[PDB]
Ligand binder design. Structure first.
Ligand SMILES: Nc1ncnc2c1ncn2[C@@H]1O[C@H](COP(=O)(O)OP(=O)(O)O)[C@@H](O)[C@H]1O
Ligand SMILES: Nc1ccn([C@@H]2O[C@H](COP(=O)(O)OP(=O)(O)O)[C@@H](O)[C@H]2O)c(=O)n1
Ligand SMILES: [Gd]
Length: 208
């Protein structure tokens, strides 16, 4: 696989886990676009920047030199060379990230970072196969029921299922504009499947 594989989908549909495993099986990096959006949100919070102040936020992001590090075991985001990854997957970041991700300048900043990577790679996000890498040779859209996505996510947050579900429903709703599947994406419902099964299906499709 020498081109680009995109994997898009709503929260907890399985994108990061599948992209990591598929990329490792193909011998290429994977790029988690949401990690950059999460970093943008985390930095704005930490800096006391008003979430509607695009200019100030962009001044900060470019000013700090924020970078995505694609490592096989998982992506990392650095700001001024320092690893912020451990702070990006909190309920707090989950709850405010959509508001920051809606800013045109932030999306343009994230996409510039993604476009700096030479192919091949597998990229996961909301609009990888539509807005960012529409030329991708292999596109996938993962989806599952809100209940199972909330069930999966609750295992990864200091929150119970019902709150996780409420939060997930809201976030996916707030992400609607950037979340439609590419028309040529293979849509897979991952509910009821193991990570291994989804990876196997995706690789089989890629290797058709
Ligand atoms: N069939 C599956 N496919 C992918 N991930 C799964 C699956 N079943 C359970 N998981 C768990 O659900 C979580 C999904 O997280 P993640 O890979 O980040 O998905 P997403 O990027 O869509 O939020 C992981 O904890 C993963 O281990
Ligand atoms: N390409 C994408 C990727 C992420 N995002 C935003 O970034 C936030 C986090 O993405 P994420 O993929 O890390 O979230 P999860 O699906 O991993 O739970 C999201 O809710 C989206 O608002 C986005 O607008 N567009
Ligand atoms: Gd993820």
């Amino acid at each position: 696989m020498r081109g680009i594989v995109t994997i898009d989908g709503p929260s907890a549909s399985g994108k990061s886990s599948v992209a990591r495993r598929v990329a490792a099986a193909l011998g290429v990096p994977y790029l988690s676009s949401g990690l950059l959006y999460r970093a943008a949100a985390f930095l704005a919070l930490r800096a006391g920047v008003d979430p509607g102040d695009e200019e100030g936020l962009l001044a900060l992001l470019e000013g700090l030199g924020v970078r995505l590090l694609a490592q096989a075991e998982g992506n990392r985001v650095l700001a001024d060379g320092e690893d912020l990854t451990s702070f990006l997957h909190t309920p707090e970041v989950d709850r405010v990230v959509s508001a920051v991700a809606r800013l045109p300048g932030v999306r343009a900043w994230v996409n510039r970072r993604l476009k700096e990577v030479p192919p091949p790679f597998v990229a996961e996000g909301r609009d990888m196969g539509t807005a960012v890498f529409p030329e991708a040779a292999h596109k996938f859209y993962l989806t599952a029921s809100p209940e199972v996505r909330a069930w999966r996510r609750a295992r990864e947050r200091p929150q119970a299922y019902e709150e996780v579900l409420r939060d997930l429903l809201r976030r996916d709703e707030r992400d609607k504009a950037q979340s439609a599947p590419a028309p040529d994406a293979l849509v897979l419902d991952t509910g009821g499947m193991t990570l291994d099964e989804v990876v196997a299906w995706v690789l089989a499709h890629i290797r058709r």
